[PDB]
Structures are given as C-alpha cells and as structure tokens.
Design a protein around this ligand. Structure first.
Ligand SMILES: [Ca+2]
Ligand SMILES: [Ca+2]
Lengths: 266, 285
C-alpha cells in the first residue's frame, strides 16, 4: 500500500555491475533512502550502462537518473519530475526532507563551480605540488579553499548536525556527495585534502559517513576517479582498472581529536 | 509604480540586461543544425519569450554531445545547459535552468509560469502513449519492407495508437472548454513550451514513420497547433523535419540512408486544408 519507486543509476565505466559517480543519481538515491528507511516508499535501485542499445531504445536518449513508478505507468526522466514526485511523497507523509534555503543553494553551487575550475586548471597544468603552483593556477585552489571555509563558517553559525538543522534535507543530498567527490579527487588527482582546520566542515563529512542514505548510495573511490578522468579524456591504465573497489570513509586523527574537543559529534 | 518610474533613470544599454547562453543538442546528421531534444526546445521557447520583450539577451549554440571538448567543458552534463557568464554561473541541471528563467519572469512581471495539474497530466499521458506506440509499431514492422498500415494492426499494438488519439481528444476537449489561445489562457506558459513541441513531434513522426496524422476532427487542438506555427518562440526553436525524424531513428535504431541524410532540411508547419477551413468557420484563428 506504499509506492514502489525504481531508480536507474549510471553504471561505472570500469565495471558495469558497480554503481557510478553521477551526483544527481546520488542525490535522488539519498532522498529515496530517507523515505525507504521509514517505510514511506518501496525502493529498488538498478545500475545501467548508458551506452547500451536497450537503454537508448527504452528511454529515447534520456540519461540517468531515471525513476519508474510502474503501478502508475509513470516514468520520470527529468530531474524536475523525479524531485517533484519525491517532494510530493515527502509532503504526503509529513517527512521534512525538503526546504528552501538560498544560502545553502549558493554555497553548494559556488563550491563545486570553483572545484571544477581548479580540477581543469591543475590537470591541464600537470599534463605538481599545490604549494609550488604558479599564481595563475594557485588562485583556483585558494578559491576552492575559500568556499570550503564559507561552508565551515555556515555550519559553525548554525551549530547543526546537517546543513539546515538536525535532520537531513535535499541540500545534504547535494553537498555531501560533492564534498566526498572533492576529497577523493583532491587526494588522488589534485594533491590536496580539505583543510584540517575546518572542524565544522569535517564534522559534517563525518556525519555523512555515518548517514545510511549516503553510505548506501556512495560509489567506490575508483569509480569516482574514473568518472572525472573519462569525461576529461585522461588515460586510465589497466592496473588502475583492476583495483579492487574501496570506499575511503576516514577522517584524519587530528581532526577527530578536534571534533571531540569542540563537541561536534555524538 | 508610475510615481516610482518617474524617480528611476534606468540605463539604456542592451548590455544592461542579463546574457543567457543556451547550449542545445545538435542534429546527428549535420551538427550545425539544431536537434530535436524536447527539453532544449522547452527552455529555448521560454528564453525567446524573455528575449522578445527585452528582458534578456539570449544566444543559442548547437553542440555534438559526443565531442571531446563538450565532454571536457561540462564534465558529462548534457544539453540543455545555460550559461550566465557575467555572474560566473553555469546551469547544467534542468531544475537550475528553469529556476533562473522563473526568477527573471517573476522579476519582470511575465506570466510565463503557472501550476496546473490538469495540464501536467495531459501532456505526460499523451507523450507516454506516443512513445509506447512508436516502440510497438517499430518492433512490429521489423523484418518487413513495406510498413504496416495502422488500420491493419493487431489489437495489442493498435491500442497504443487509440490511446494516443484518446489523449489528443482529451486535449481538444480541454481547449474547447477553455476557449483559450494557449493551453491556460491568452499568454504562452511553460506548458505550451512542453506540449507544442510534443504535438509537432507527434505530427511529423506520425506522417513520416508511423502512418497517421493527428485526427482532423480535433479542431480546437489543430487551432492550438496553428497557434504554435504562428508563435515566434516556437518557430525559432523548432528543428527541421529531418532532424526530428533522425532523433527518433537514432534512438529507435532505425536506418537512415545517404539520401535522407542529404535531404535538404525543411520545416513543415502546414495545417490540413479542411481543418483550416473548420478553424476559420469557428473563428478559432
Ligand atoms: Ca535524468
Ligand atoms: Ca541538462
């Protein structure tokens, strides 16, 4: 007597059995998990290879995320449609999953925008150590750090476990995957981690790594790395290809100590 | 506001108003031609509404989604994508693109966005049944040199066609009761930006591939299609017939020979004769 929603997510380009690193797939999967956890929806998630013939013919060129509600004969291929259906369901069963917060919206966009500029600038430059970067590349790195600081500041003013309060919202479903992508790509491709002095931001990342919605929907490190390399036309050798999948959900020991001192975790 | 209007010296530079660039999926036959992506046409129509009244500057550019530069520049995002360079902003997600256009429409008192669950259901139900019929008939005709006529189809294929006609009929009925130029009233809204391209796709694909026209007795609907073919927002953003056909062929994996690949592009915006008369004799145009 509760709706079944099937979510199609883009598969890893390395192994089509593994979930890929599309951020919009993780956003909706997180939302759906939040409804699933509390018995408001039935949810199946399926991986798909977007280059496949059956995929193209079945969705006429739509890309994941795609959500299906067969009991209603409804296919939601557009992100507006998927969000609207999940919002309707959240609202129906009084689940506080959606809120409007222009501050979060701006912080999220601006962080990832600067991340993308830095990723491209540094990869092209390296075709190095961040400390040694010349001004014209280093400025992109600094701007990423500035946005990370801004979110640290926001979390520090709010004193909240999640971005808007003590419960998860659509904005965590967007920011947490972006932060984790920033970490994984930072450490592997760019030469940096999130600055250790941003204790609130790190506490929020710990919160992500303790949130079942995030954990269950999180791609392996190798699949995050391949996602960006593939779109950037960066070669991935077979050693890399064959790496057994891992999920790096660790916090630096000194950061964990700082989190305890300031009381930023349970 | 007039009192206030007398107290504002708002500048007269075309470069005052926001510049929004829309990247649209190109034709897979000739990448210089606009493709048939329905979300691209929806937002282009909305941008044109704002463009034509001087609310925004708008440029449109076609892209081969398979190009290395496009993949690298937008990290896998697909058209439609909207750029507002002067704000350093890139809207890659349809929620973001709509959000920005919605904001601007509101800010300048433009009645472009409304909420209507009648309209939203009718649009979805029409295109859903069209897609079912497209897929069912294409598969039925596999291994035949001459395609089947719709009138000869067995019940489990023909039902999708009948459901298409039912939904077209439902929309005709809604328009007849509303007596409006556009779907919701006198002004183009986002729902027109969704239905008019869908209707035109259905008309072109019906005549060219599936063996049917939008029924000629649906006079109010045909009047609304005529409205489309007289709305600059629609006309300017409308792909050529060959690119609409190719769009569905390339995903339905159907064969495009050298000839229709070399077919010179045309845009068929023609109402049937008796239908145009019916429209005139009811004053629907
Ligand atoms: Ca989608
Ligand atoms: Ca898009």
């Amino acid at each position: 007597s509760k709706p079944l929603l099937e979510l199609y997510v883009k598969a890893s380009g390395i192994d089509a059995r593994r979930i890929g690193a599309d951020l919009f797939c993780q956003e909706f999967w997180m939302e759906l998990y939040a409804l699933y956890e509390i018995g408001v929806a039935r949810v199946e998630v399926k991986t798909v290879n977007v280059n496949s013939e059956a995929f193209k013919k079945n969705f006429l060129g739509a890309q994941p995320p795609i959500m299906i509600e067969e009991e209603k004969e409804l296919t939601y291929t557009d992100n507006r449609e998927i969000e609207g259906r999940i919002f309707h369901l959240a609202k129906e069963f009084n689940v506080p999953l959606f809120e409007k917060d222009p501050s979060a919206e701006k912080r999220i966009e601006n962080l990832y925008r600067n991340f993308k500029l830095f990723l491209r600038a540094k990869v092209e430059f390296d075709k190095s150590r961040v400390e040694d970067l010349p001004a014209q590349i280093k400025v992109h790195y600094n701007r990423v750090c500035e946005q990370l600081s801004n979110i640290d500041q926001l979390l520090s003013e709010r004193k909240s476990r999640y971005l808007l309060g003590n419960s998860m919202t659509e904005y965590d479903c967007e920011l947490m995957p972006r932060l984790h992508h920033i970490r994984i790509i930072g450490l592997s491709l760019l030469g940096f981690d999130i600055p250790h002095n941003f204790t609130h931001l790190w506490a929020y990342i710990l919160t992500a790594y303790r949130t079942a919605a995030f954990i269950e929907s999180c791609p392996a490190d190798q699949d995050i790395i391949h996602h960006y390399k593939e779109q950037m036309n960066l070669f991935t050798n077979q050693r890399e290809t064959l790496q057994s999948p891992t999920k790096t959900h660790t916090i630096p020991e000194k950061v964990l100590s700082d989190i305890r001192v300031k009381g930023l975790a349970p």
